[PDB]
Design an enzyme around this catalytic site. Structure first.
Site, mmCIF file in Angstrom:
data_model
loop_
_atom_site.group_PDB
_atom_site.id
_atom_site.type_symbol
_atom_site.label_atom_id
_atom_site.label_comp_id
_atom_site.label_asym_id
_atom_site.label_seq_id
_atom_site.Cartn_x
_atom_site.Cartn_y
_atom_site.Cartn_z
ATOM 1 N N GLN A 98 0.877 -1.164 0.000
ATOM 2 C CA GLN A 98 0.000 0.000 0.000
ATOM 3 C C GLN A 98 0.916 1.215 0.000
ATOM 4 O O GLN A 98 1.762 1.371 0.891
ATOM 5 C CB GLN A 98 -0.920 0.048 1.231
ATOM 6 C CG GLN A 98 -1.913 1.224 1.183
ATOM 7 C CD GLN A 98 -2.708 1.415 2.475
ATOM 8 O OE1 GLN A 98 -2.141 1.715 3.525
ATOM 9 N NE2 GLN A 98 -4.029 1.245 2.396
ATOM 10 N N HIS A 179 -3.238 4.491 -1.747
ATOM 11 C CA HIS A 179 -3.987 4.895 -0.557
ATOM 12 C C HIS A 179 -4.714 6.224 -0.786
ATOM 13 O O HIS A 179 -4.154 7.285 -0.544
ATOM 14 C CB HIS A 179 -3.032 5.033 0.642
ATOM 15 C CG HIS A 179 -3.707 4.969 1.978
ATOM 16 N ND1 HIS A 179 -5.047 5.242 2.155
ATOM 17 C CD2 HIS A 179 -3.215 4.695 3.211
ATOM 18 C CE1 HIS A 179 -5.351 5.141 3.437
ATOM 19 N NE2 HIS A 179 -4.256 4.809 4.100
ATOM 20 N N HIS A 182 -8.837 7.449 4.127
ATOM 21 C CA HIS A 182 -8.534 7.916 5.476
ATOM 22 C C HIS A 182 -7.912 9.295 5.677
ATOM 23 O O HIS A 182 -7.128 9.498 6.608
ATOM 24 C CB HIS A 182 -7.677 6.844 6.161
ATOM 25 C CG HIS A 182 -8.312 5.485 6.154
ATOM 26 N ND1 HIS A 182 -7.622 4.335 6.465
ATOM 27 C CD2 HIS A 182 -9.585 5.102 5.888
ATOM 28 C CE1 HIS A 182 -8.442 3.299 6.393
ATOM 29 N NE2 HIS A 182 -9.639 3.738 6.044
ATOM 30 N N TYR A 184 -5.665 11.004 3.849
ATOM 31 C CA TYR A 184 -4.268 11.223 3.491
ATOM 32 C C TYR A 184 -4.232 12.084 2.231
ATOM 33 O O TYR A 184 -5.285 12.530 1.782
ATOM 34 C CB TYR A 184 -3.533 9.876 3.361
ATOM 35 C CG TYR A 184 -3.368 9.245 4.738
ATOM 36 C CD1 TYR A 184 -2.656 9.908 5.740
ATOM 37 C CD2 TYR A 184 -4.033 8.065 5.081
ATOM 38 C CE1 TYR A 184 -2.622 9.428 7.050
ATOM 39 C CE2 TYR A 184 -4.003 7.574 6.398
ATOM 40 C CZ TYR A 184 -3.303 8.263 7.372
ATOM 41 O OH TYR A 184 -3.304 7.813 8.674
ATOM 42 N N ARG A 231 -7.464 1.942 -2.634
ATOM 43 C CA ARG A 231 -8.338 1.909 -1.475
ATOM 44 C C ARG A 231 -8.965 3.288 -1.314
ATOM 45 O O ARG A 231 -8.286 4.305 -1.423
ATOM 46 C CB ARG A 231 -7.565 1.539 -0.201
ATOM 47 C CG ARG A 231 -8.486 1.296 0.978
ATOM 48 C CD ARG A 231 -7.791 0.772 2.229
ATOM 49 N NE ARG A 231 -8.616 -0.247 2.871
ATOM 50 C CZ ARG A 231 -8.545 -0.594 4.153
ATOM 51 N NH1 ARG A 231 -7.687 -0.003 4.969
ATOM 52 N NH2 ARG A 231 -9.323 -1.560 4.614
ATOM 53 N N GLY A 321 -8.541 -6.574 9.449
ATOM 54 C CA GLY A 321 -7.403 -5.871 10.011
ATOM 55 C C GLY A 321 -6.957 -6.421 11.351
ATOM 56 O O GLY A 321 -6.034 -7.228 11.435
ATOM 57 N N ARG A 322 -7.633 -5.991 12.407
ATOM 58 C CA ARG A 322 -7.295 -6.411 13.757
ATOM 59 C C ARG A 322 -7.256 -7.917 14.001
ATOM 60 O O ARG A 322 -6.382 -8.394 14.721
ATOM 61 C CB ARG A 322 -8.231 -5.705 14.735
ATOM 62 C CG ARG A 322 -7.938 -4.201 14.777
ATOM 63 C CD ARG A 322 -9.044 -3.376 15.436
ATOM 64 N NE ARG A 322 -10.228 -3.261 14.588
ATOM 65 C CZ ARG A 322 -11.266 -2.485 14.874
ATOM 66 N NH1 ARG A 322 -11.258 -1.764 15.987
ATOM 67 N NH2 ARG A 322 -12.302 -2.418 14.052
HETATM 68 C C1 LIG Z 1 -3.242 -0.799 14.064
HETATM 69 C C2 LIG Z 1 -3.956 -0.181 12.854
HETATM 70 C C3 LIG Z 1 -3.277 0.337 11.777
HETATM 71 C C4 LIG Z 1 -3.892 0.554 10.470
HETATM 72 N N1 LIG Z 1 -3.134 1.003 9.419
HETATM 73 C C5 LIG Z 1 -3.697 1.107 8.220
HETATM 74 C C6 LIG Z 1 -2.883 1.345 7.016
HETATM 75 O O1 LIG Z 1 -1.646 1.396 7.037
HETATM 76 N N2 LIG Z 1 -3.575 1.670 5.892
HETATM 77 C C7 LIG Z 1 -5.015 1.613 5.763
HETATM 78 O O2 LIG Z 1 -5.500 1.871 4.681
HETATM 79 N N3 LIG Z 1 -5.762 1.390 6.890
HETATM 80 C C8 LIG Z 1 -5.167 1.048 8.030
HETATM 81 N N4 LIG Z 1 -5.910 0.595 9.104
HETATM 82 C C9 LIG Z 1 -7.311 0.193 8.831
HETATM 83 C C10 LIG Z 1 -7.401 -1.320 8.606
HETATM 84 O O3 LIG Z 1 -6.882 -1.733 7.346
HETATM 85 C C11 LIG Z 1 -8.868 -1.792 8.696
HETATM 86 O O4 LIG Z 1 -9.630 -1.260 7.564
HETATM 87 C C12 LIG Z 1 -9.541 -1.504 10.024
HETATM 88 O O5 LIG Z 1 -8.745 -2.058 11.100
HETATM 89 C C13 LIG Z 1 -10.969 -1.965 10.190
HETATM 90 O O6 LIG Z 1 -11.046 -3.393 10.030
HETATM 91 P P1 LIG Z 1 -11.049 -4.418 11.233
HETATM 92 O O7 LIG Z 1 -12.292 -4.207 12.047
HETATM 93 O O8 LIG Z 1 -11.152 -5.785 10.469
HETATM 94 O O9 LIG Z 1 -9.785 -4.297 12.023
HETATM 95 C C14 LIG Z 1 -5.334 0.410 10.405
HETATM 96 C C15 LIG Z 1 -6.034 0.019 11.568
HETATM 97 C C16 LIG Z 1 -5.409 -0.387 12.748
HETATM 98 C C17 LIG Z 1 -6.242 -0.695 13.978
#
Ligand SMILES: Cc1cc2nc3c(=O)[nH]c(=O)nc-3n(C[C@H](O)[C@H](O)[C@H](O)COP(=O)(O)O)c2cc1C
Length: 362
Positions: A98, A179, A182, A184, A231, A321-322
């Site tokens: 990404q 990206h 969010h 950016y 994204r 993600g998490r």
């Molecule tokens: C620790 C952390 C870091 C993340 N970093 C990114 C990232 O680098 N780029 C991005 O597009 N979203 C990022 N996200 C969003 C995740 O990709 C994801 O969309 C989000 O955690 C919601 O999904 P989940 O409920 O399955 O965790 C981040 C979220 C968490 C909690």
């Protein structure tokens, strides 16, 4: 269940639809914002994922907004990533990088020369980013007020995205994910709340989407359309950046434009971590008919929600993600219906192996 069936994603084929969402972990080496062997191990442990989308990675030094975030600009970074993609491929996995430019979500102390970061307009994001203290520990800090780019600087921005993609190919990544979500840089231009420009990059949705579409065309021309993913988070408010009073209409416009390029996939971040309004099945249908490639859903997905939407044919895959942070073998667990390891949020950002590579597999 169809969550564990093959899916053609651009130039590659994923054996399942359980993807690993992009996750910033801020454990890169400074100076140099270099990926580490520890990071390689982390990604290797998660190679059974249908597709791994890496943590947000800088397309340039200027793109930097977080201490510990990796870059894909510089010989050292490229060499480091080469080992990571090799590790994933050694486990027969697939990985997409990404790429981002944080824009106004940054601090002057980590920008070239210690100068103000850049953006669509000179408006502070009114939020915080993550830096490192004297001992290398992650800490929060208010974002530095940005400098509005300047017309003649735009081509340079598109070029940085193009070069990073060229480096990504050389680095062994299977795909790239732009990206533009969010809050950016790309999203900063897309949104009227963060974009007050009066040139051709501000105003109408067509103008606001100009930059992102120039990047898509450039990276597509550099590598190949079936290698490009993007994204977006076009509905709701993310990191203080909303999507305007006509977010739905503006989202459909952007997607129809992206569709014309026949790119590999459309990754939709449906809600901020803080929550948001759910996507109606009507909107999902409108998106569905406008994009002819793979559509990845992300947000607060449970395996059940994913199966339901994939079954309705509204999306093709789901990025977790998490759950992926805490379960390297999430695929096996979801397929076997086993229990997941509990999450340890305190170690999501920064630090070392603890809370990174110590989540066990079944
Ligand atoms: C620790 C952390 C870091 C993340 N970093 C990114 C990232 O680098 N780029 C991005 O597009 N979203 C990022 N996200 C969003 C995740 O990709 C994801 O969309 C989000 O955690 C919601 O999904 P989940 O409920 O399955 O965790 C981040 C979220 C968490 C909690």
């Amino acid at each position: 269940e169809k969550l564990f069936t093959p899916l053609k994603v651009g130039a590659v084929t994923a054996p399942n639809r359980v993807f690993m969402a992009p996750l910033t972990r801020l454990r890169s080496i400074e100076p140099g914002d270099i990926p580490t062997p520890l990071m390689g191990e982390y990604y290797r442990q998660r190679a059974s994922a249908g597709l791994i989308i890496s943590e947000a990675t800088q397309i340039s030094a200027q793109a930097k907004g977080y201490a510990g975030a990796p870059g894909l600009h510089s010989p050292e970074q490229i060499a480091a990533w080469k080992k990571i993609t090799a590790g994933v491929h050694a486990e027969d996995g697939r990985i997409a990088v990404q790429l981002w430019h944080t824009g106004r979500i940054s601090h002057s102390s980590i920008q070239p020369g210690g100068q103000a970061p850049v953006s669509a307009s000179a408006l502070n994001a009114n939020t915080r980013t993550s830096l490192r203290d004297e001992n290398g520990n992650a800490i929060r800090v208010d974002t530095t007020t940005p400098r509005a780019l300047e017309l003649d600087e735009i081509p340079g921005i598109v070029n940085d995205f193009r070069q990073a993609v060229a480096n990504a190919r050389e680095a062994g990544f299977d795909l790239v994910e732009l990206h533009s979500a969010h809050g950016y840089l790309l999203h900063q231009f897309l949104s009227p709340s963060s974009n007050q420009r009066t040139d051709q990059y501000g105003g109408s949705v067509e103008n606001r989407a100009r930059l992102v579409l120039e990047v898509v065309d450039a990276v597509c021309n550099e590598w190949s359309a079936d290698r490009i993913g993007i994204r977006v988070s076009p509905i709701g408010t993310f990191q203080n950046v909303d999507n305007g009073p006509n977010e739905e209409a503006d989202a459909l416009y952007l997607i129809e434009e992206l569709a014309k390029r026949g790119i590999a996939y459309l990754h939709m971040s449906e809600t901020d971590l803080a929550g948001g309004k759910p996507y109606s099945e009507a909107f999902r249908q409108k998106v569905r008919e406008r994009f002819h490639g793979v559509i990845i859903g992300a947000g607060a997905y449970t395996a059940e929600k994913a199966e339901d939407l994939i079954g309705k044919g509204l999306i093709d895959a789901v990025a977790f993600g998490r759950d992926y942070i805490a379960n390297p073998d999430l695929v096996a667990r979801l397929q076997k219906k086993a229990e997941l390891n509990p999450q340890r949020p305190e170690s999501f950002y920064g630090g070392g192996a603890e809370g990174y590579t110590d989540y066990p597999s079944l």
